[PDB]
Amino acid sequence: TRAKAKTRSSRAGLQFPVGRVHRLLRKGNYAERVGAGAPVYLAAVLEYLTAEILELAGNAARDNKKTRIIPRHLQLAVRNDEELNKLLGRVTIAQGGVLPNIQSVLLPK
Amino acid sequence: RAKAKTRSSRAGLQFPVGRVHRLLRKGNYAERVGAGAPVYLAAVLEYLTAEILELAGNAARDNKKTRIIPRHLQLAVRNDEELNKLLGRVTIAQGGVLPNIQSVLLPK
Amino acid sequence: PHRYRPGTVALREIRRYQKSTELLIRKLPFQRLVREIAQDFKTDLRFQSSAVMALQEASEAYLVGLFEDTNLCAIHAKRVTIMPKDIQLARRIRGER
Amino acid sequence: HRYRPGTVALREIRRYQKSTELLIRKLPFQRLVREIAQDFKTDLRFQSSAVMALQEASEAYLVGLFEDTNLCAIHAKRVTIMPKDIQLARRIRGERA
Amino acid sequence: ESYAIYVYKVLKQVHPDTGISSKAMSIMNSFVNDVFERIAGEASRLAHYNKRSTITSREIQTAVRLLLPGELAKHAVSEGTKAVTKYTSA
Amino acid sequence: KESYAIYVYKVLKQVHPDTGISSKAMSIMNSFVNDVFERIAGEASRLAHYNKRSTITSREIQTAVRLLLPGELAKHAVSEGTKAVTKYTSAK
Amino acid sequence: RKVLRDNIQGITKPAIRRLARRGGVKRISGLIYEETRGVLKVFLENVIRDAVTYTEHAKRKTVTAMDVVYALKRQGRTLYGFGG
Amino acid sequence: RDNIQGITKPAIRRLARRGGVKRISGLIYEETRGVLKVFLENVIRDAVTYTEHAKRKTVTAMDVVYALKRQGRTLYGFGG
Amino acid sequence: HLTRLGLEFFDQPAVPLARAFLGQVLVRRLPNGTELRGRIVETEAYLGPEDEAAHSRGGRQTPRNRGMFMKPGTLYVYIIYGMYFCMNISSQGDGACVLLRALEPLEGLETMRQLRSTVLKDRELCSGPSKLCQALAINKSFDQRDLAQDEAVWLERGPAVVAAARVGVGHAGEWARKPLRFYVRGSPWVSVVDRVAEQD
DNA sequence: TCTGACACGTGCCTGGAGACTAGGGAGTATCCCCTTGGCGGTTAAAACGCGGGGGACAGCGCGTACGTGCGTTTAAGCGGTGCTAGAGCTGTCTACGACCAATTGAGCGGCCTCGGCACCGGGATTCTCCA
DNA sequence: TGGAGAATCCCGGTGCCGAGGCCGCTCAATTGGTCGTAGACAGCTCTAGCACCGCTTAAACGCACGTACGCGCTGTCCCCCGCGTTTTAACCGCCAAGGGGACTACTCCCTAGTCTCCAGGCACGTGTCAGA
C-alpha cells in the first residue's frame, strides 16, 4: 500500500543525512518549530564545506606524495586558505602542527 | 483562597522570580524549568546588580554627584578586577576610559 | 612671548580627553561615512539616529583601545611616537586582519 | 668542526615546524595536571584522552604565544625573546590586566 | 518589560540617597539581560551535555561557577543557596 | 554513537576517489561538522528569537550562513543550499 | 538619491589626535592617520555588513539600533546602552 | 609537590623552535612555566566543574573539550 | 419622508453602479441629532470572481464577507490594516460590488474634525476610504444593516467623468489595469489623481 | 620488507519515511509619524605656515650570556601483571513540573512637580618655563 | 632659584529639564488541582584507570669555550608639536515630501503528532595494502 521509501537526501541530491539534520534541529532546543527546507539547506551547506576541506586536504596529501588524509593535511588545508582560516581561527586541530614560517630577520645573510 | 504572596517575597528578593521563570520558559533553553532555578538566578542577578550599584554609588559620591551617570558605572567596572574580568568584552556607552598615563611619557 | 615645551600640551590633552565622556569624531562626517559604506551593500537604505550613535560609540571605543595597545607597542620599542608598524603589530597580535 | 651560532637553531626551526609530534613529555605533564587538579577536587580520576587533550591545547597555546613573542621581539629590533615580549603579547590579547 | 524598578529598589537598598539616570538604567538593564542570557545559555548547554531536559538550581549553580570569576562566583552561590533555602522553607 | 563518517566517505570518494583517510582525520571532520552545525543552528535560533518567529526556515539558515561564513564561502554555500532546496521542492 | 564618494577624509587629523589622546598617546606620526582611517573603514564595513544582513532578514529598509547591537554582539564587542 | 620543573628547558626550547624563535633568554623558562600553569589552572578548573556537575570522579575528554570551548579554544579530534 | 431611496435603485450591474453612483450625497445620522451632507466624488468597482484583486476571487465564500449575496445594495463594512475600515456595497448578482473612495462635505466639518482625532485641513479631512470611515463614526457593527432602511446612513439625490488606472494593487495579473475608478474632472480634492489619464 | 589500520561484506534494529489530521503561525490587507533633503546665518573648529627642538635612527664599542658540543646521569617509555574504583546501563516508582481555570494585585503608561546639575563669571591657587 | 603668565579649581547665583512620585487599570503572576513522566535511587556488570617492577636507551643536565648580540653612549637631522591666522563646513533651527512601518483581523498552508514498517546505518569479522 505504502509507496517506495525514497530518502530526502536523494530528493535534494545531497549526501548528508537531511533526516538526521532535521532530528538534531528538533531536539537541539533551537525553536519550537522547524521548517521543511531548513535541514535540506543546512545539509547542503555542511556538504559544501566538507567538500571544500576534503579538496584542499587531498591536494595537500597529493603534494606530500601520500594517498591518505592525516590531520597535518587538514591543518594545511584550513590554514593555507584565507576564508577557512577565518572560519577556523579559534580552532586547534589535534596532531596538526604549524606552517613552516621563518622571518626575514632570522634567516642568514 | 489565601493572600497572594509573590515568589520574590517568600524568597527574600527584589528581582522577580516569576519574570525569570517566564523568560526561561519562553527562551527555548530546555523543555522543563525547575522551581528553584528562577529563585537562584534572581538571587545571582540581584547580587551582581547590587555589586555594580554599590561601587557606582561610591564613584558618584567621590565626584560629588548624587545621581549615577554611565561614567560612574564605567569607573565601577574597570576598577574592580572581577567585574572587569566579567565585562572585558563590553563597551559602556558614554563611559570613557580610566585615567591612565604611562610612566615613560610623564616628564622627569 | 610664552611658549610651552613640546609634550606639555599633549599631556594636558591626555588628561582632558581621558576625564571626559564625549564622542570625539564629528557626528555628520561619521554619519556620511556610514551612509557611503552601507550603500555598497544595499541601496536605498535608511538609518535611525541611535544606530549611527551606536556605531560611533563602538568605533570610538575600538579606536581608543587600539591606540592604548599601539602606545604600549611604541613603549616596547623604546619610543614615545606611534607608527603604522605599531598598529599593524597590535592588530596582528589581537588576530585582526 | 664547530657550527656557527644560529644554524642549528634554524635547523631545529625547520625540523620542528614539519613534525606533528608532542614536544612535552607525557608523564611530567600528567603529573603537572594531577598536581593542579589536586587543588580543585580531591581523588580525581583522569582519562588518558583528557591528558592528551590538555597536552594538545597547552602545546598549541604555547606555540601561538611564542609566535606572538617572536613578533614582539622582532618589533623591538631583536632576535632574542625576553619576558617583556611575552607580557606584551599576553596583554594585547587580553590575557593580562 | 524592563528591570528598571528592581534596579531602583536594589539601589535604594544599597545607597538610599543616590539616584540614577536614564542612560545608566538602560546600561543596567542591558547588564541584567546579558548576565541572564549568559547563565541561561550555559545552563541549557549543561543540560544538553548531561542528557537532561530540565534546568534546576544545580544547573544555574554550576553555570555561575563557570561564568563568574572567583569571589563573584562564591558570593553569588552564597545568596543563591540562601534564596533557594528560604524559598523552600517558606 | 551516531556520527558523520560514512557521509565523509561519500563526499571524499565523490571528489578524491583514489584517496583514503585516517581515523583521527574523521574525528576532526566529525567535530568540524558538529561545530558548523551548532554555529548555524544557534545563529538561526537567534534570528528567530529576534523577529518573534517560532519557526526556523530556510531563510534563517541562509541568513546564518551569510553572517557566519566568509565572503566567497558564503556565496557558494548559499548557492548550494538554494540549489538543494529548489531540487527538493521541485520533486515530489 | 545620489552617490557618496571620499567621505573617509571627514575623519579629520585632529579627531584621530583626540582619539589617541584618550588612548594615552603623547606623540603621533604623520602616517598614523591614513592607517587609522583604513582600520576604521574595515571595522565599519564588518559591523555595517552584519547590521544590513540583520535588517534584510527582517524585510525592513531602516537600520535600527538593535541591529547594530546584535551585529556587535556577533563580533564579541557587546554594547550597553542602546537596548538589549 | 613541584611538578612544574618537569616542563623542562629543552621542552620550552622545542616549543619556541616550533614557534619560530631563533634565540631564547634564560628568563623565558620561568615565565613560560607560569603562563602554562595559569592556562592549565583555568582549563582544569572548568573541566573539574563540568565533571562535578555530572556527579563523577573521573575527568573525561568531553569535559576538557567543553572547558576549552568555553574559553574560545575549540579542539577537534577528541570527540567535540 | 420623500428624501429616502428604496431598493429599486440597487438592481444594477458592477460597472453602472460604479458609474451611476456619483454626485449622490452620503448622509450619516450619528446620535447627537446632527447631519453631515457629504457628497462623494469617486468610486471603485470589484467584479468578484473574475476580478483577481477582489476579495471573492474564484468563488470565495468566507464568513466575514457574508453580507453580499442575499440582495443587491447590501452595505458591507470591512476592517483593513488593523483599525481602518472600508465601505463596500454589493450589486446585482453574487460577487459584484462597488467601493466608496472619497467625498467632500458642504457642512458639519467641525464635528468630523472633532471626531477625526483619537494637520486637520479640509483637503485631507476625508480624502480616503478609511478617512471617510473614521470621519463618519463607522464601526464594524454596520455590516448587519443595509443601505435603505430605518434611520441610519443613506443617500440623497444631487443636481466630466474621468476613468483612471488602478493604484495600489501592483503590476501583476490581468485585471489590475482596467480603468474602473471614475472621478470628477478638475477637482483639487481628489486623493489619488492621474495627470496622464485626464486627456482621454 | 613486515604489519597494523583502514576498506569491505554481513546481520539485526531502530529511527526515518509515507500518510493522515489539527490547529496555529505567518502572510497579507491605508494612513500617519520618521527620516531625509534643502536653506540659511553663525561660529567652532579644521587647515595651512612656520620655527625650532627633541626624539628617531644609524653607527660604534664592549662585555657577557646563550649556543653548541660532549661526557655522564636519569627517568621517560614500553611491556607486563594485578586489582578494584567507578562509568554505564537497566529497572522501578514517585515527586515534580507542565497545563489549565479562576482570581487579583503589581507594574506600566500617562501626568505633573521641583531639585540636581550644567553653565557663567570672578577670584584664589597650582604649575610651567625662563632670566 | 624667584617671578610672570596661563591654566585650573572653588564658590555663588540662575534656570531648565528630566528623574521621581502618584494613579488607574489590565495583563500577567498567583493559587489550587490533575495528570504523566523525567529523573532519583538501588543494583549489577565489566571497563578502564591506577599502582608497581624491570630495562634500555633517548633525552636531560652540568660544564667549557666564545662568539654573536643586547645595550649604553653619541651625533644628526628630520619630523612633529605649539601657536597664530585664515577658511571650511559642522551644528542648529525650520520646513516640506514621501516612502516605510505600526497594526490587528483572517484565512490558509504547513508543520507537529502519531502508526506502521522497512531499509539505511552501526557493530563486528576478514584479509589487504600503504608506510615505516
XYZ file of C-alpha atoms in Angstrom, chain D:
97
model
C 84.292 21.127 13.480
C 82.067 23.658 15.261
C 78.986 25.177 13.649
C 78.178 28.873 13.708
C 75.790 30.011 16.478
C 72.360 30.069 14.868
C 72.374 27.465 12.100
C 71.463 24.598 14.450
C 68.620 26.808 15.710
C 67.423 27.336 12.124
C 67.685 23.584 11.506
C 65.596 22.990 14.636
C 63.027 25.548 13.436
C 62.814 23.779 10.067
C 62.568 20.297 11.601
C 60.086 21.211 14.363
C 57.699 23.055 12.025
C 57.230 19.936 9.868
C 56.523 17.299 12.534
C 53.211 16.943 14.371
C 54.597 15.057 17.398
C 54.113 16.210 21.003
C 57.018 18.177 22.416
C 56.486 17.942 26.174
C 56.979 14.522 27.744
C 53.827 12.652 28.715
C 54.448 11.708 32.377
C 55.678 15.151 33.638
C 52.675 16.829 32.007
C 50.371 14.210 33.535
C 51.914 14.820 36.966
C 51.503 18.582 36.473
C 47.829 18.134 35.515
C 47.182 15.960 38.580
C 49.051 18.423 40.834
C 46.911 21.298 39.533
C 43.656 19.313 39.805
C 44.504 18.326 43.398
C 43.797 21.939 44.411
C 40.261 21.796 42.992
C 38.909 18.341 43.868
C 40.493 15.517 45.849
C 40.905 11.995 44.364
C 40.108 12.716 40.728
C 40.449 10.009 38.125
C 41.729 11.079 34.719
C 41.124 9.560 31.326
C 44.223 9.277 29.159
C 42.404 11.172 26.399
C 41.812 14.055 28.837
C 45.552 14.411 29.492
C 46.279 14.138 25.757
C 43.691 16.853 25.021
C 45.211 19.082 27.709
C 48.670 18.492 26.216
C 47.497 19.354 22.689
C 45.772 22.527 23.914
C 48.757 23.594 26.042
C 51.268 22.978 23.241
C 49.142 24.879 20.704
C 48.663 27.786 23.128
C 52.385 27.966 23.906
C 53.367 27.810 20.218
C 50.948 30.643 19.340
C 52.229 32.642 22.329
C 55.813 32.082 21.173
C 54.876 33.275 17.670
C 53.484 36.496 19.154
C 56.571 36.721 21.398
C 58.817 36.425 18.330
C 56.820 39.183 16.619
C 57.255 41.409 19.690
C 60.993 40.657 19.828
C 61.455 41.401 16.115
C 59.430 44.605 16.595
C 61.886 45.884 19.235
C 64.832 45.233 16.825
C 65.885 41.971 18.460
C 66.074 38.283 17.698
C 66.331 37.157 21.345
C 62.944 36.833 23.032
C 62.597 38.243 26.553
C 59.823 38.059 29.198
C 58.633 41.589 28.350
C 57.735 40.284 24.880
C 55.606 37.540 26.491
C 53.951 40.058 28.830
C 53.204 42.459 25.954
C 51.840 39.683 23.717
C 49.594 38.481 26.537
C 48.406 41.971 27.472
C 47.426 42.839 23.885
C 45.315 39.694 23.537
C 43.701 40.434 26.911
C 45.157 37.595 28.988
C 46.777 40.000 31.481
C 45.330 43.157 33.026
